[model samples]
Target: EMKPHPWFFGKIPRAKAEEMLSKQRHDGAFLIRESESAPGDFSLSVKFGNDVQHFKVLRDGAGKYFLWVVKFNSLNELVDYHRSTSVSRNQQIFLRDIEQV
Candidate 1:
């Protein structure tokens, strides 16, 4: 079975993909439960205070990826802040950002 993307990239020792996959499965399950219980307005926010009301991941024909954040208000008013963020387009995408929000 194909593993989840996050766990596949989080493997350690550079050789323990299987072990990492197992742990990721467990962790992913826990995260699902935790996210359901957490209380907060879960909107994607960027470093410069860009509040993303909606977002879609973009992928090129060659499999490169990016993300676009759309900003809007509860009344559907067009918010001034919106932007597309480029997620690193590389095979080692797993070795990239790992910061908590």
Candidate 2:
């Protein structure tokens, strides 16, 4: 049931996306380097089960990160549903919200 979400399919480059998927088994946090437009940012690692169709990344003012699960199709559309929440004490603020189109 693994389906690529719009963010995963369009936003993330294929090579990087594959790299991200490859680390799913480790079940640990991995730093996702920010692109030119998206700077000083990183994605807190996460795992996806076979049933997971899609996911999302969120950040707050202090650069804290959060992950949300969604359906592949829904990735293209904006929705409010966070499957889980993780916080980094090193960061000052948790993900206040996400901006996706």
Candidate 3:
């Protein structure tokens, strides 16, 4: 059987995502939540220092996903790509780890 991606927190609100990442309290910790501004898309909430930043993950008509200018065929790929790479241009943060259990 297939397991859901660990980072994908399905349909959670921005407040909930912020609460989680806040609780996690580690820089670069992150989780993916369904976007409130646009349903069916996603938002990536990552912890940075004492604050959290959210980024939109847009879906194209062809079923690919985009975070900024980069594209991925699956949400898994998107998360994986950011693990080794910075999530923002001006910051050195990456998808370092998930929220504490």
Best candidate (score: TM-score): 3
lDDT of 1 at 23: 41
Q: Per-residue lDDT of 1-101 in model 2, one digit per residue for the tens?
A: 45533222334543564465444443222323333345543333223332112222556565444544323233223222232333332322222221233
Residue range 29-94, candidate 1, lDDT tens digits? 101101112232221211211211122223345443334443233211211121122322321111
- What pairs collide in candidate 3? none
The TM-scores of all predictions, comma-separated, are 0.19, 0.27, 0.88
Q: Write the per-residue lDDT of candidate 3 for residues 7-92, one digit (tens) a residue.
A: 87889889888888887756899988888789888889999887889998888889899888878998888988998999978888
- Which portions of model 1 miss their true places by more than 4 Å? 1-52, 68-101
lDDT of each: 0.23, 0.34, 0.85
Candidate 3 — which residues are off by over 4 angstroms?
1-4
Candidate no. 3 TM-score: 0.88
